[PDB]
Amino acid sequence: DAEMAAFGEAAPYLRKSEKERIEAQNKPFDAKSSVFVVHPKQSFVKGTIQSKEGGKVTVKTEGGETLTVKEDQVFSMNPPKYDKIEDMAMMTHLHEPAV
Amino acid sequence: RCNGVLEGIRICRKGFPSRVLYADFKQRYRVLNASAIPEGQFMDSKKASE
C-alpha cells in the first residue's frame, strides 16, 4: 500500500490491498477435511471430505455434489496463507490442482 | 504440461517444493517465538526469518 504508488493505478492488477490480503490469509481453515478432487466433467473441483471408505473417499463439492473417489483422486489444499501467491512454487502443496 | 510449468513443479517437489519469501515469512509466523522471530524479521527482512 505504502509501497505501491509508482503503479498506483495499475496496483489493483499487480497486487491487492493490504487487507484484502489479510482478510484472505487470516481466515478459518480445516486442513484434515478441506481438499481438491478429481472430477469427470470439470477437471478438478474443490470439496470437503465427508467420510473415508478405507481407500475410497466421499466428498462434498463446491456447488454441491457428492462423489466417492479413490484415495489418489484426492489432493490436499493449501492453507489460506497461500491464496494468490506470487510464486506458486512457494506453496507447500505441489499438486496439479493447486496450480 | 506442455509448458514446462508442471515439470518445474515436479523437479521442485523432489527437491524443496514450497519456497517462502522472507517478509511473507515474517508476518505469518513471527508469532511462533514471537519475541525472537519478530526481532529477526524486523531487524533484517531476511536475517529475521533466519
Place this chain on the structure above:
Amino acid sequence: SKAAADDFKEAFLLFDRTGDAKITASQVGDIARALGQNPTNAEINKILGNPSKEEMNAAAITFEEFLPMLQAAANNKDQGTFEDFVEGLRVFDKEGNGTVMGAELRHVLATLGEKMTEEEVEELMKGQEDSNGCINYEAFVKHIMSV
C-alpha cells in the same frame, strides 16, 4: 527409601504456609526442584493430569501423595547430562569460544518452549554476563549446575 531422608518432610513444613501439613498441587513442581529434582513443567503437568488430577481447581496435599510423586520424578534425573547442555550453547554461537550475545539467550529462554519470565532470565544472567554483552556459557552452565 530412608536411606530414609526425613528432611524432605521437614522441607514440606517450610513450604506449607498454613502449617496443616498439606502442600497445594501448584507448589509441587517447584518443591520437587528444591529437593534436588528437575522435572520439566510439561512432565509435571502430564503426570498430574495422567492421574485425573486437575491443577485448575483448588488443591491440597498430603505428604502421602507428594512423597511417591517425588519418587516417580527421581528416576528421570538420568536426563541431566551436562555434555548436551554445553554443546547446545556451543552450536548456538560461532567461533571457538563459549559466548552467547546477551539478548540471544534472554529471548530464547523466555520464548522458546517452556516460557521463562524475563525477570527469571535476568536473575540467571546477573553476574555471569558483563558489559561486553557476551555470556561465557562455560562458566555460566557451571554456575547453573552449582545449585
